């Protein structure tokens, strides 16, 4: 046994977070904030944009990771997300904006790194299928397997994914206990704030035939 | 989306996402005890935070500065209440 899962049925998941060659400190801090939360992931930096998309696959095969979260930077100003099942599974592309990182002293919330989250989804993540595919991809990227030996055990935070206009808004809150008056959970927000606008669904790993197209996207 | 009237209402938009993670947290807590795991961190688990400790030190200093400004301004009120 090599997958370090102590559970009745092992959820073998790994992610590989990556960066482009021109990200900003705001996009760099979202690597550090997301990877700190994400206990079964490896950090890597500065993928060559002159390479091809499917060289992100054997990069992840080199590190035994079935998920990849790529931060691609264009113009030195714009963050673009990529969630993908590495061998042959589907992928996604987002435009990320309205960034607010953990280093900014205005959130007043904190939690253990590596602790297991609760995934707080939205109602439209169930009824409409283009939200459903990214739902399973979000759930796998933040999978945090059961018997993972790098995970701290007590649960104190919940990740909230909600769609408002056409865009998904992420939220992170800390579970805190205040006793009821003759204990209820009060949420204090911890970490990353970003707004996630879908762009495409591709049926391949990083190419493959196009499945969803967001025909309302105003590019920067 | 039905909870949010206007997307520029920062107070209501924050409350809507907070309310969404509210019933997720209470429902998850109920199901987690029914199966049964250690859910709440005890007083003795000195475990490593997702944030740097010094970051909490400067955010504790900022909460000092905001709250001490409010009460010192109230002392300025009482001085000028004597003035009138």
């Amino acid at each position: 046994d090599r997958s370090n899962i102590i559970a009745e049925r092992k959820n073998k998941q790994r992610v590989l977070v990556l960066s482009s060659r021109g990200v900003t400190y705001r996009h760099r801090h979202l690597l550090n904030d997301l990877a700190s939360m994400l206990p079964h992931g490896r950090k890597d930096a500065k993928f060559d944009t002159k390479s091809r998309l499917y060289e992100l696959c054997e990069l992840a095969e080199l590190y035994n990771c079935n998920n990849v979260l790529f931060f691609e930077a264009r113009k030195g100003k714009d963050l673009y997300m990529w969630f993908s099942k590495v061998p042959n599974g589907p992928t996604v592309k987002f435009y990320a904006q309205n960034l607010h990182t953990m280093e900014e002293l205005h959130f007043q919330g904190n939690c253990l790194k590596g602790s297991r989250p609760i995934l707080s989804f939205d109602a439209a993540f169930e009824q409409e299928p283009y939200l459903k595919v990214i739902k399973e991809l979000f759930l796998h990227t933040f999978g945090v397997p059961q018997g993972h030996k790098k995970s701290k055990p007590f649960i104190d935070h919940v990740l909230s994914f909600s769609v408002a206009d056409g865009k998904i808004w992420v939220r992170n809150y800390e579970i805190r206990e205040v006793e009821k008056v003759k204990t209820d959970i009060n949420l204090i927000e911890i970490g990353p704030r970003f707004v996630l606008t879908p762009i495409i669904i591709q049926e391949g790993s990083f190419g493959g035939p196009i499945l969803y197209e967001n025909k309302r996207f105003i590019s920067p | 989306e039905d909870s949010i009237p206007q997307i520029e209402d920062d107070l209501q938009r924050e409350l809507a996402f907070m309310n969404q993670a509210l019933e997720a947290a209470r429902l998850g807590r109920s199901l987690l005890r029914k199966e049964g795991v250690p859910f709440t961190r005890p007083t003795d688990y000195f475990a490593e935070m997702v944030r740097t400790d010094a970051t909490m030190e400067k955010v504790k200093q900022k909460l000092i500065e905001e709250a001490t400004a409010k009460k010192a301004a109230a002392e300025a009120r009482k001085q000028r209440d004597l003035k009138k």
Binding site: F121, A123, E126 | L27, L31
Partner: peptide
């Protein structure tokens, strides 16, 4: 009551 919540479908269903 004969109603519980399904986490994976987000609905209410009977026992």
């Amino acid at each position: 009551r004969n109603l519980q919540y399904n986490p994976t479908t987000g609905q209410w269903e009977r026992k």
